[PDB]
Structures are given as structure tokens and as C-alpha cells.
Amino acid sequence: RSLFTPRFEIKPYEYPELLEFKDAIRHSYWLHTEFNFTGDIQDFRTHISDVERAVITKTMLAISQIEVSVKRFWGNLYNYFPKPEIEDVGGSFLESEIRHKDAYSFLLEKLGLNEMFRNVRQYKAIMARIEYMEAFMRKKDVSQQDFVLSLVMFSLFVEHISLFSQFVIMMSFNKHKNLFKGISNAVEATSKEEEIHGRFGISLYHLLREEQPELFTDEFYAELKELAEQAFNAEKAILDWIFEDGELSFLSKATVENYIANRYNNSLVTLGLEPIYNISPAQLKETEWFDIEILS
Amino acid sequence: RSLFTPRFEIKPYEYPELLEFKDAIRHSYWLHTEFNFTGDIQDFRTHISDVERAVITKTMLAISQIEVSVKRFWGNLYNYFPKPEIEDVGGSFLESEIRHKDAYSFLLEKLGLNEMFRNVRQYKAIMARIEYMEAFMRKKDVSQQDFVLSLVMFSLFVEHISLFSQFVIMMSFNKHKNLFKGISNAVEATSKEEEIHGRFGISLYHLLREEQPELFTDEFYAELKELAEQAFNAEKAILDWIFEDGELSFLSKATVENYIANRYNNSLVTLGLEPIYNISPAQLKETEWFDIEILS
Ligand SMILES: [Mg+2]
Ligand SMILES: [Mg+2]
Ligand SMILES: [Mn+2]
Ligand SMILES: [Mn+2]
Ligand SMILES: [Mn+2]
Ligand SMILES: [Mn+2]
Numbered sequence: 407r408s409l410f411t412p413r414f415e416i417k418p419y420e421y422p423e424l425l426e427f428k429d430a431i432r433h434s435y436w437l438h439t440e441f442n443f444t445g446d447i448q449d450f451r452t453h454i455s456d457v458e459r460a461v462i463t464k465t466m467l468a469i470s471q472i473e474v475s476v477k478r479f480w481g482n483l484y485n486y487f488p489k490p491e492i493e494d495v496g497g498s499f500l501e502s503e504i505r506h507k508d509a510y511s512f513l514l515e516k517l518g519l520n521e522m523f524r525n526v527r528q529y530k531a532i533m534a535r536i537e538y539m540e541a542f543m544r545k546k547d548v549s550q551q552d553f554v555l556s557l558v559m560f561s562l563f564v565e566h567i568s569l570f571s572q573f574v575i576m577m578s579f580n581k582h583k584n585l586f587k588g589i590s591n592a593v594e595a596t597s598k599e600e601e602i603h604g605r606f607g608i609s610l611y612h613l614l615r616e617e618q619p620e621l622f623t624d625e626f627y628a629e630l631k632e633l634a635e636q637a638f639n640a641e642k643a644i645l646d647w648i649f650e651d652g653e654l655s656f657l658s659k660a661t662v663e664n665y666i667a668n669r670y671n672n673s674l675v676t677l678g679l680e681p682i683y684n685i686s687p688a689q690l691k692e693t694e695w696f697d698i699e700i701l702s
Numbered sequence: 703r704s705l706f707t708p709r710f711e712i713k714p715y716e717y718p719e720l721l722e723f724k725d726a727i728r729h730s731y732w733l734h735t736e737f738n739f740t741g742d743i744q745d746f747r748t749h750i751s752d753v754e755r756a757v758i759t760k761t762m763l764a765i766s767q768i769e770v771s772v773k774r775f776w777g778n779l780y781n782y783f784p785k786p787e788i789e790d791v792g793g794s795f796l797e798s799e800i801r802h803k804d805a806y807s808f809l810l811e812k813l814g815l816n817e818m819f820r821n822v823r824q825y826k827a828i829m830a831r832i833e834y835m836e837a838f839m840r841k842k843d844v845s846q847q848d849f850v851l852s853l854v855m856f857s858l859f860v861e862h863i864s865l866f867s868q869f870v871i872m873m874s875f876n877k878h879k880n881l882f883k884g885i886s887n888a889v890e891a892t893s894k895e896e897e898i899h900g901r902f903g904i905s906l907y908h909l910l911r912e913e914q915p916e917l918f919t920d921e922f923y924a925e926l927k928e929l930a931e932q933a934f935n936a937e938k939a940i941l942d943w944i945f946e947d948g949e950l951s952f953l954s955k956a957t958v959e960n961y962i963a964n965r966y967n968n969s970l971v972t973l974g975l976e977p978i979y980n981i982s983p984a985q986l987k988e989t990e991w992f993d994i995e996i997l998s
Binding site: 428474481484494497511520 | 712724728733771772774777780786789793796797803807816820
């Protein structure tokens with residue numbers, strides 16, 4: 407049994423447990439047309455302060471900078487792991503990313519953000535994210551080991567963390583102020599699907615660690631740690647930018663930073679590595695409603 | 703404007719009209735778990751003749767030989783036409799083919815046809831189909847002209863013709879005898895999506911004819927006609943095989959042949975070529991109910 411070995415016949419499956427990720431993404435299926443964003447537009451116009459409007463503007467630009475794009479990694483995974491069950495999951499995930507793109511493209515239009523988004527790659531903090539996401543993928547085609555590192559970084563640090571500070575910010579407006587219910591619904595649906603995407607990569611990692619332990623060298627983990635540090639520093643910079651004009655009365659920048667730092671620790675621990683950030687349990691209690699909503 | 707030219711920015715779309723095929727396939731979305739097949743299994747065991755059982759067995763094997771496979775052409779289209787709107791349609795189409803695969807894999811298992819399907823290449827007519835489908839694709843990466851020929855043959859023949867004799871056969875049991883209602887519903891839903899798939903390819907053909915006329919040489923059309931004839935001969939052989947133990951009391955082989963010969967003529971006319979076959983109006987009237995059902 408090897409993930410890298412092509413298999414022509416559909417059945418019997420070699421990795422039947424992976425099909426649960428296809429079942430999961432079918433259950434999570436959603437389209438933005440299931441929500442009416444009229445109340446969100448009203449909220450953006452007259453129910454928030456200028457400080458809050460600046461936060462929401464930059465948070466939605468940051469979400470869209472990932473979601474409003476062509477995302478083909480999961481759809482292409484079969485080229486590296488040529489298994490029928492890999493294509494079943496990867497192609498279903500790619501379609502889910504089309505649905506996400508349509509949702510956030512619609513929201514950019516409705517919030518009047520198209521012009522700002524056209525220039526989004528101008529913001530220094532966005533450039534920092536682009537830098538690490540490009541670094542994550544740069545060598546994916548060089549070797550099996552380099553591909554596996556790209557897969558791990560994408561699954562555990564992009565899919566499970568990059569957008570989550572923005573997801574928490576947007577859903578916090580609904581939790582604390584009963585505002586932006588439509589965007590809260592779209593963000594919740596998106597979060598659940600990104601959780602599924604990253605968990606697929608975690609399963610692949612555990613399989614790969616058993617099948618080809620020689621890929622997982624000291625050098626592999628040292629580079630992974632360096633890349634994860636670059637990613638966290640960039641997502642902190644995104645938070646500094648989002649809150650540059652003032653913080654929210656109901657959710658501080660530090661609390662959001664603590665939330666994603668805990669997710670970096672969790673990803674490192676999932677990989678077998680040590681956690682490195684000192685987490686506030688009190689601030690985690692402040693945001694734990696989000697994890698209960700997304701995962702329960 | 704050129705389909706071969708990469709575009710990075712999502713909006714504005716260069717080919718916004720192609721997004722209607724994404725809308726269409728979202729509207730047609732279905733899973734086989736929406737249907738109860740228990741009545742169909744009982745029908746297969748107890749409510750049909752030995753002649754009818756042979757027809758259904760081979761017809762379901764023939765549908766499955768295409769549908770129960772790894773089908774990546776639409777997902778890979780972006781590699782050749784690197785447009786966001788192409789990925790939107792192609793990725794959504796690929797996911798629809800995963801749903802088709804799951805439906806017919808389920809029906810193979812429920813009808814006890816797994817072992818027959820494992821040996822489906824023993825059948826001469828199936829080998830004839832494999833041969834033309836391989837011929838359609840084997841040069842797709844040699845040149846732009848070869849890729850477009852593969853795209854045209856896949857669109858106008860594999861998606862619009864290959865399975866449709868089998869779709870008509872399966873839905874005819876419900877139409878004339880109120881049997882196999884579950885499979886009728888699944889085949890109807892499959893037919894609607896294959897219609898959408900082929901229509902997308904037709905739209906691409908018309909665009910390419912205008913943008914890239916240098917591809918559509920006398921030699922291109924000569925090779926197209928040769929491949930189309932090879933494919934139609936093979937689908938006639940599939941029909942001969944499906945009915946070789948006897949024809950149905952309510953639907954003759956000639957009537958089904960006439961139906962697909964008309965579709966074949968129509969694909970040729972769509973391409974600007976002459977129709978090949980004389981078509982019986984009376985037999986077309988016998989199967990008109992099917993086109994009404996699919997096109998509603
Ligand atoms: Mg909920
Ligand atoms: Mg109907
Ligand atoms: Mn997404
Ligand atoms: Mn994702
Ligand atoms: Mn299909
Ligand atoms: Mn199709």
C-alpha cells in the first residue's frame with residue numbers, strides 16, 4: 407500500500423477511510439444564495455462605528471484575498487497520489503472552493519469593496535501572507551519529500567489557520583452584537599469546510615509517516631518549523647493591519663492573536679512537534695464559543 | 703480574447719456566458735441517496751423476464767463502464783484554457799462525475815453485478831468502445847489542434863451520444879411498465895447533467911471556431927469524421943450486444959438505433975457537417991417522450 411502508486415481499478419479501495427472526507431464535504435455543501443445579505447449591508451451602512459467599518463472592510467478583504475482566487479491544489483492531488491479515492495476527495499474539495507469563491511466575490515460586490523480588492527496585493531501585511539503561501543508551494547514538484555512538506559504546510563497551516571482570525575472577527579459581530587447574521591452564516595459554513603480540508607491533510611500525513619518514514623528527517627521538520635514561524639508572523643501582521651485604526655470593544659486584537667497562536671500550537675502538536683506559543687486560557691475562554699459552534 | 707491565454711484576475715470575466723453552465727450543473731445537482739432503489743432490486747429479481755434481465759444487466763454494465771471510472775477531463779480543462787470561468791465550469795463538472803460514479807457503483811453492487819463488471823473488458827463491444835475512447839484522447843497533449851479535436855470528440859460524442867442509448871433503454875422500463883422507478887430517476891438525473899456537459903463543449907467549439915480558425919483545417923474535419931464513425935459503429939455494437947438475447951416487447955433495437963442515429967446526425971450538423979443517416983419519423987415519435995423528459 408503506497409499513496410504514490412497509481413491504481414486503475416476503483417474497487418476494492420486501498421484507503422476506504424479517506425472517503426469519509428467526501429461524505430463530510432457533501433454534508434457541508436452550501437451556496438451563498440441560501441442566505442440573504444440585505445441585513446448585512448444595512449448593518450455595514452448604519453449599525454457600526456467608523457472603527458468597526460474599518461475592521462470589517464479589512465477583514466473581508468483578507469478573507470477574499472484567499473477565497474476569491476483560483477484554488478487547484480486539492481483538485482490536482484491525484485497527480486501525486488493517483489488513487490480513485492484521492493480524486494473523489496480532492497475533486498469534491500475543489501468544487502467546494504468554487505462555492506467559497508462565489509460567496510466572497512458576491513460579498514465584495516455587495517459591500518462596495520471591488521476597487522479596494524483590485525489593489526489588495528498593495529497592502530504590506532497582505533504581501534507578507536503572499537510571501538509565505540508562495541514559499542509553502544515553491545518546491546512542491548521537486549521531489550516526494552518536498553511535495554509532502556508542501557501538503558503538510560498547506561493542510562495544517564493554510565487550510566486550518568490562515569483565514570481563521572478573520573472568521574472569528576466576523577462571527578464575533580453576530581455573537582456579541584447580533585449584527586451581520588448573513589455573513590456569520592457564510593463564514594460558519596466556510597469554516598466548517600476548511601476544517602474538513604485540513605483534516606484530510608492530517609490523515610494523509612499520518613499515512614505518509616507510516617508508509618515512508620524516511621521522508622520525515624530532522625531537516626524536514628526544521629524547515630517546517632521555519633515556515634510555520636513565517637506564517638504566524640504574517641498572520642499577526644494581518645491582525646495589526648486589520649486593527650490599525652482601532653480595536654473592537656468586544657474582541658481585542660490580543661484575544662484574536664491568542665486564538666490563532668493556539669491553532670499554530672495545535673498543528674505543531676498534531677505533527678508530533680512541541681507547542682511554542684504561550685496561550686492565555688482566559689482569552690481562549692473568550693473565543694471558545696467559536697470552536698463549539700464550528701465543530702459541534 | 704483567446705481561450706488559450708492565461709488570465710489571473712477573476713473579474714471581469716472574459717467569457718461570462720460560460721458561467722451559465724456552472725449555474726446549470728448546480729441546479730441539476732443530485733445524489734443517488736435521494737432515491738430508493740429497493741423496488742428496483744425487487745423488480746430485477748421477480749418482476750421481469752429472462753430477456754428483460756439480460757437487457758438490463760448489459761445496459762447497466764455499459765453505463766457503468768463509462769460512469770464507474772476516474773473522469774478528470776473537465777477538471778483538467780483549465781490546464782489548456784487557463785481562465786477562472788473555465789475552472790468554475792470544469793471543476794463543477796468534475797464533481798458531478800464523482801456523483802455519477804457513486805450512483806452507478808452503488809447500483810452495480812445492489813444488482814449483484816460487481817463480478818460481471820470486473821470482467822467487462824471480455825465483451826467485444828465494450829472493447830470497441832474502449833478503443834475509440836482511447837483514440838479520441840491519445841494525442842490530446844501533442845498540439846493545440848490535437849487537444850481541440852479531443853475536446854470536440856469528447857463533447858459531441860462521448861458526452862452527448864455514448865450513454866444515451868442506454869439511458870433511453872433504462873427509462874423505457876418505467877415509461878411503459880412502471881418498473882425500475884428508482885433507476886429511471888437516477889438515469890434521468892444523469893442524462894440531464896450529460897446534456898449540460900456536452901452543451902458546454904459545443905459552446906467552446908463555437909468560440910474556438912471564431913478565435914482559432916487555423917485549427918479547423920480540412921484534415922481536422924477528415925480525422926473528426928473518421929473518429930466519429932468509429933465511435934458510432936462501436937455504439938451500434940454495444941446496442942447489438944445489449945439485445946443479443948432478445949429485444950423488448952415495448953422498445954425495439956431499431957427504435958433505439960434510430961434515436962441515437964438522429965443524435966449523431968445532429969452532432970455532425972452542429973459541427974457544420976452533413977448528416978449521414980436517413981431517420982425514421984415514426985420511430986422518433988416513439989422515443990420523443992425521452993427528450994421531453996430530459997429537456998424540461
Ligand atoms: Mg451553527
Ligand atoms: Mg422528469
Ligand atoms: Mn475556501
Ligand atoms: Mn480549503
Ligand atoms: Mn457522467
Ligand atoms: Mn459527463
